[PDB]
Design a protein around this ligand. Structure first.
Ligand SMILES: [Mg+2]
Ligand SMILES: [Mg+2]
Ligand SMILES: [Mg+2]
Ligand SMILES: [Mg+2]
Ligand SMILES: [Mg+2]
Ligand SMILES: [Mg+2]
Ligand SMILES: [Mg+2]
Ligand SMILES: [Mg+2]
Ligand SMILES: [Mg+2]
Ligand SMILES: [Mg+2]
Ligand SMILES: [Mg+2]
Lengths: 46, 242, 201, 95, 122, 87, 95, 72
RNA sequence: AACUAAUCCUAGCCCUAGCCCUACACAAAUAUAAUUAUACUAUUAUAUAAAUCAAAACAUUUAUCCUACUAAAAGUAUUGGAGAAAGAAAUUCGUACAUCUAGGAGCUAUAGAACUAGUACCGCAAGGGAAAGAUGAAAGACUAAUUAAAAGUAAGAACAAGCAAAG
């Protein structure tokens, strides 16, 4: 079949998989946020 | 750029500024000082010099302490300085064999220990070394009181020491009430360890506990400036009358 | 914005917006720093042009762009241009002034018309005044019309403008009461209920 | 070998050379014969005598041993009662 | 493919997603899925009578502005409290216990309008 | 122009500040103190009695000497025995 | 307890310094495990009369487990410290 | 109050009104006002990052003074 | 007789020196699907760094990585499939420019920071990550000029025969 359409948007999935609360739930996720803060990213998470 | 101070001096700098500076001088001495604990997992060199057998020459020797891992569980017990040795071994004890990860674990036991100064029986996770040390110290109270922070190696052990020292410092009648003669005998037996009440309060506290304690001591609601100005006004008015 | 360049056109005007777009990245102009105390030239001051096309000609200041250390004299250092040009018509020829830097002019002694250098010094009352370096004298601050076009003396207030007396009337009586308490008592509101305990944290 | 060491930035001696060869100050190197201690029961008497001797090294071997040791091993040593006292110098050498 | 930079608002997301736009709550949602508006929770505008009022939006350009002197605790204290204490001190009828007589408030509890923590809006 | 005054070494005994963290450790040892007296003598202010070993230090020196440095008589006696054993 | 020794020699550090260790200094060998040592006896002064040990005040040597488990915990015996020795010695002399 | 957030910074925390005390509020307690040890390496990186910015700003001022004095 | 283009100088950067810091810079909102004024539902880093690589393979081993004053002792003693390599100390020396905020036989728009920006854009996410600007004293003087000058074209297609030129 034709590929390239693997993104099937869903806001509930997006915020649950990559959101603020998800990232702060684990120390590894908190370190992800710290790295993005040190780089200066405007968007720390979804 | 460069930091003004080397990284190893950073901890000392913090203790010299802020709320840390306001801590009592005796407490900071305990934090500042670094003393090596008594050897447990290695044999110390008896002498400072030995003869190198090959060339037959006098050689300086030093004691390099083995790195020991102390699990957080150990802070709820009275291990006699014992810990986990995380290291490697050579299979078959030959240098030309594989290097294998090896952890040597202490043999732990649960025992009941009675404190005369506290008149309470505690259930503690303990090693045979601790029991031997208590025997050498002629009682559980002596072991806790005599042993320094480094050798004791337990937050619970340090907590017990503060209780005993505070009990002795205040001569608290809460020990064996209705038997003043028994209370006196216990205090007399441990009279050597008495220290000022102020010092006993800070024994065994961690830095975070000390900062919380100091914050509570200096916590105060702000003074209404109505009162402050009134005092200034009254003094000036009173002085004018003089 | 660092790349903004101050020009003769007033900041924020249509002309300035055209000159200073967000994407302009022109080379910075270098201006000799002059402290607020150091500056001694003000609008309405008669000054003399030390050098240039109009060297030796006295003029009156009418604009001061301090960010460029500029002083503009009316009718001097003047080039020619057409104003109001349209496709149909050429416009009107006018003489347009160009800015003069501070060091290219000197202030003028009032009694004797000469380019006297001046020094800042306080007075008996304590008010700061410019004094001539030679022939020591008080060069008073000149009076210039307000930029917005408002002449206070000629001003006659219309509706929605408070009268002088009303604005200056004193009604405040100092007391240890908030505006809320004052208004309720004045307006006669009565409230006897009290908020229950709330925990802040 | 190590030309520039991490700690001192210097050349390093190859200790296996220092453990097998002797340098005379004149520039010569001494060595033993390979196998002089091996299977002597099947070697002829003349062969054993040849093996026991101390022998010199060639110009290329001497050049290699010079590269593999640092200058400290090339200095004058004034040992009391040295048995090689006479062999640190060359006499009547025209070349 | 999602937009990470735009704000998260109730217009976006599924219907189940809802959130406020910053309006203060005026009531409670009880059981049975019922909204119960509370009269006290609804702000009431205290509007004065503007009849006979001489102050208008603008001021005469000829009106002199005064020297800026922001009010301070000392300035307030001198204007209000100092004369009473000074007069009482001369008469001698002054004591520390009765500072409330001159307007001191020992505690803010029980006041409709508390200065700290503030319990009224602007 | 006139050249600036010539660079000169700091003269006199120098006692570093003990409390200052930056001050190097080596400058605060008793070894450093003795060096001040040696260079500048009396003006150093060092109490001369400190230069000699203290009684506890004296015992350590004497204890060390006995273990590793024998007396002449003991050295002679041991050498005599070895010769007899060799003989 | 477990007593271990390093396989690899650690170079000396000097008086006021600590040695910098390397990965190979983490390889150990077991010199001894104190569990398997011959076990000493523990000496107590009795505070009562208990079967097959002695009368109050006697000096005995007993297995460490027996002393801690029963004599010390139950109050039958007290530690044979010099202070305890002096007190009970006086009592016997008067008796 | 002055509190340390989970990212290792010091921020002023504005209190809110609640009907129950803090120890009985399960939503509030889930909020963390402490930083774990993995944050110290990031704390140093911020300090060093900031120190570089300050060093460049001071250098640039000194360079700009050169231009002024050379020009004037 | 010219189009496409070209020319430009400062935005800032680099390395040192010096110096601890204490900046923690409205209201409101935010740990709930962050930035949603109030209860529901409790809250908490990690046991030893590994491997690549060197040993011309690889299997013990392999500087820095994994920091505790400079210079010397010394690449010495010692350690090492005694191979590759690794490598002290005792013991001597050192008052460091001091003063105040300085300096450049460092870069000048493909350089110097990735930076005009951690933006645009790309990725579900961790993450990756650009490009570029140029008048004058004055634009409240109509925005400046300067250049047979790159390739590419045009002005001006070609004319038996040939590495395209050379005699
Ligand atoms: Mg795709
Ligand atoms: Mg699907
Ligand atoms: Mg040394
Ligand atoms: Mg290999
Ligand atoms: Mg292969
Ligand atoms: Mg391979
Ligand atoms: Mg391997
Ligand atoms: Mg660039
Ligand atoms: Mg770039
Ligand atoms: Mg061309
Ligand atoms: Mg042809």
């Amino acid at each position: 079949r034709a590929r390239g359409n693997e993104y099937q948007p869903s806001n509930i999935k997006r915020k649950h998989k990559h959101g603020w609360v998800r990232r702060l739930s684990t120390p590894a996720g908190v370190q992800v946020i710290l790295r993005r803060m040190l780089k200066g990213r405007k968007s720390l998470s979804h | 750029p460069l930091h003004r101070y080397p990284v190893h001096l950073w901890q000392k700098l913090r203790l010299r500024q802020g709320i840390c500076a306001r801590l009592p001088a005796h407490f900071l001495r305990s934090l500042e000082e670094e003393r090596t604990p008594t050897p447990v997992h290695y044999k110390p060199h008896g002498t400072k010099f030995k003869i190198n057998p090959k060339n037959g020459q006098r050689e300086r020797v030093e004691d390099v302490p083995i790195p020991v891992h102390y699990p957080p569980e150990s802070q709820q017990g009275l291990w006699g300085g014992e810990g986990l040795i995380l290291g490697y071994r050579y299979a078959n004890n030959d240098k030309l064999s594989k290097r294998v990860k090896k952890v040597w674990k202490p043999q732990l036991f649960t025992r009941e220990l009675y404190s005369e100064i506290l008149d309470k029986k505690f259930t503690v996770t303990v090693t045979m070394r601790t029991l031997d040390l208590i025997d050498e110290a002629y009682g559980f109270d002596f072991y806790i009181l005599k042993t320094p922070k480094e050798d004791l190696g337990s937050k619970f052990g340090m907590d017990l020491k503060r209780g005993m020292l505070l009990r002795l410092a205040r001569q608290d009648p809460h020990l064996h009430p209705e038997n003043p003669e028994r209370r006196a005998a216990i205090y007399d037996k441990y009279r050597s360890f008495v220290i000022p009440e102020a010092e006993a309060e800070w024994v065994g506290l961690t830095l975070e506990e000390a900062l919380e304690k100091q914050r509570l001591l200096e916590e105060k609601d702000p003074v209404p400036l109505f009162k402050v100005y009134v005092e200034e006004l009254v003094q000036r008015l009173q002085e004018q009358v003089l | 914005s660092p790349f903004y360049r101050y020009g003769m056109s007033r900041p924020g005007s249509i002309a300035d917006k055209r000159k200073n777009p967000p994407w302009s990245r022109r080379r910075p102009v270098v201006v000799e720093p002059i402290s607020d105390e150091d500056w001694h030239l003000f609008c309405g001051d008669m000054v003399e042009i030390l050098e240039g096309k109009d060297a030796g000609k006295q003029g009156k200041v009418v604009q001061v762009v301090r960010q460029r250390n500029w002083v503009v004299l009316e009718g001097l250092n003047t080039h020619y241009r057409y104003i109001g040009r349209t496709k149909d018509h050429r416009g009107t020829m006018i003489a347009s002034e160009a800015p003069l830097l501070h060091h290219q002019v000197k202030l003028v002694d009032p009694v004797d018309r000469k380019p006297t250098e001046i020094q800042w010094r306080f007075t008996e009352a304590g008010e700061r005044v410019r004094v001539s370096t030679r022939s020591g004298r008080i060069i008073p601050k000149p009076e210039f019309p307000r930029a917005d076009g408002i002449v206070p003396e000629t001003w006659t207030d219309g509706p929605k403008d408070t009268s002088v007396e009303d604005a200056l009337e004193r009604t405040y009586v100092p007391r240890l009461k908030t505006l809320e308490e004052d208004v309720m008592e004045a307006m006669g509101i009565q409230e006897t209920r009290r908020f229950k305990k709330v925990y802040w944290y | 070998l190590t030309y520039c060491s991490t700690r001192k930035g210097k050349r390093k001696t190859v200790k296996s050379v220092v453990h097998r060869f002797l340098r005379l100050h004149s520039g010569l190197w001494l060595r033993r014969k390979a196998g002089y201690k091996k299977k002597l029961w099947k070697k002829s008497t003349a062969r054993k005598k040849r093996l026991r001797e101390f022998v010199f090294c060639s110009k290329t071997q001497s050049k290699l041993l010079d590269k593999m040791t640092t200058s400290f091993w090339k200095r004058r040593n004034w040992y009391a009662g040295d048995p090689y006292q006479m062999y640190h110098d060359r006499t009547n050498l025209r070349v | 493919g999602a937009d990470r930079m735009s704000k998260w608002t109730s217009k976006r997301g599924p219907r189940t997603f809802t959130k406020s736009r910053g309006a203060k709550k005026t009531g409670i949602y009880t059981s049975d899925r019922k909204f119960v508006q509370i009269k006290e929770m609804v702000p009431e505008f205290v509007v004065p009578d503007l009849t006979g009022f001489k102050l208008k939006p603008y001021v005469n350009y000829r009106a002199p502005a005064g020297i800026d002197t922001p009010l301070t605790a000392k300035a307030l204290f001198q204007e209000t409290v100092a004369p009473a204490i000074e007069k009482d001190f001369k008469e001698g009828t002054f004591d520390a216990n009765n500072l409330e007589k001159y307007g001191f408030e020992p505690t803010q509890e029980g006041k409709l309008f508390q200065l700290y923590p503030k319990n009224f809006p602007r | 122009y006139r050249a600036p005054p010539p660079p000169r070494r700091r003269p006199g005994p120098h006692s570093p500040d003990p409390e200052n963290l930056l001050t190097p450790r080596w400058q605060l040892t008793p070894r450093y103190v003795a060096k001040q007296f040696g260079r500048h003598g009396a003006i150093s202010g060092v109490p001369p009695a400190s230069l000699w070993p203290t009684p506890e230090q004296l015992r350590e020196l004497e204890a060390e000497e006995q273990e590793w440095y024998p007396s002449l008589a003991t050295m002679q006696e041991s050498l005599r025995l070895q010769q007899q054993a060799l003989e | 307890t477990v007593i271990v020794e390093r396989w690899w020699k650690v170079p000396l550090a000097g008086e006021g310094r600590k040695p910098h260790l390397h990965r190979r200094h983490r390889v150990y060998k077991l010199v001894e495990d104190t569990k398997h040592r011959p076990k000493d006896n523990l000496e107590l002064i009795l505070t009562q009369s208990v079967d097959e040990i002695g009368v109050r005040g006697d000096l005995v040597s007993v297995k460490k487990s027996v002393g801690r488990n029963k004599l010390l915990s139950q109050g039958l015996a007290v530690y044979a410290s010099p202070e305890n020795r002096k007190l009970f010695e006086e009592e016997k002399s008067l008796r | 109050a002055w509190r340390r957030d989970i990212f290792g910074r010091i921020v002023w925390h504005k209190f809110k009104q609640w009907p129950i005390p803090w120890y009985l509020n399960k939503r509030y307690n889930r909020r963390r006002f402490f930083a774990m040890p993995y944050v110290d390496r990031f704390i140093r990186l911020r300090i060093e990052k900031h120190a570089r910015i300050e060093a460049r700003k001071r250098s640039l001022q000194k360079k700009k003074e050169k231009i002024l004095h050379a020009k004037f």
